[PDB]
Design a protein around this nucleic acid. Sequence first.
DNA 1: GTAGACCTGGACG
DNA 2: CGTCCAGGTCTAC
Length: 314
Amino acid sequence: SEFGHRTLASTPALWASIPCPRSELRLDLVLPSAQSFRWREQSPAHWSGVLADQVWTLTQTEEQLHCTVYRSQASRPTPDELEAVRKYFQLDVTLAQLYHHWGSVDSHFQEVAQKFQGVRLLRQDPIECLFSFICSSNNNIARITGMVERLCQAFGPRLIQLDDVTYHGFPSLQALAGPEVEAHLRKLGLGYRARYVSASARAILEEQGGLAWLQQLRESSYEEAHKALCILPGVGTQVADCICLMALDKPQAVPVDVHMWHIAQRDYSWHPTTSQAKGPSPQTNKELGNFFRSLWGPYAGWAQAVLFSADLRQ
DNA sequence: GTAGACCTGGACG
DNA sequence: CGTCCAGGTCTAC
Ligand SMILES: [Ca+2]
Ligand SMILES: [Ca+2]
């Protein structure tokens, strides 16, 4: 009871709640939907992972988001630490207001929106988001998830252990830019992305002015941020969009992958009209992105997150 | 602006 | 056992 991952039932006194209706957040529809690849449902309906450099377990009731943290001396989370969670799930953003708007201008979103409530966007750390998505290219979520895990296990700070699970924080640029990192990542099976990781880490540290260069993109504009990110190895339009949307506060950024392409064709009968290409191409992918923006608005990225998530549950 | 190939490994035939 | 195929990016014409 004092060991292993906690559950709301077993260690009652160690959980603190945050008012949050399932209409505003559905953990099972956000955490395993390829925004963050670091959450695991260790026990039914309980998700644990690293947030704000500490390990947490989250679970929800119809009107509450229950939280518990593992830092010395087991205690319920504090209001300050709880804010860390609120900020991670960007709770100041009312999802009901967004769904209502998207639903108003897009009949198809409406239909899907009724079956998939609470799909919101996580506010992620730039470094973790940058390297996790460099790992997502031409790959499948199950594999991506493993890659990221082994990568953190080998190069990230060790935090605490629950059961047989040792949690690690996300690696720093220095660690990823270290000597022989590529070869070690290839042994961990990242394929050719192994080179993308060490190259992009070194590129950022020895050419772009380090971490500061990335974090300042949050104040920068979407157009600039997206272009800057495309400088890095392994980072194309799609990965860059994922980063702008999920880590740089660019809510209009719209990732265009195989999923969003199928969705566009199947649910909107969309086809490239200004691009020469007939199928996926750097030009058409860009047009689709603008298409979704002119359909959903300033938060088109968040609308994209709802349909992508729903298309996964298929 | 456009075909090909490219690490890895779980589903098709 | 052996081809797509997955939250694509890159590079040769
Ligand atoms: Ca693909
Ligand atoms: Ca690039």
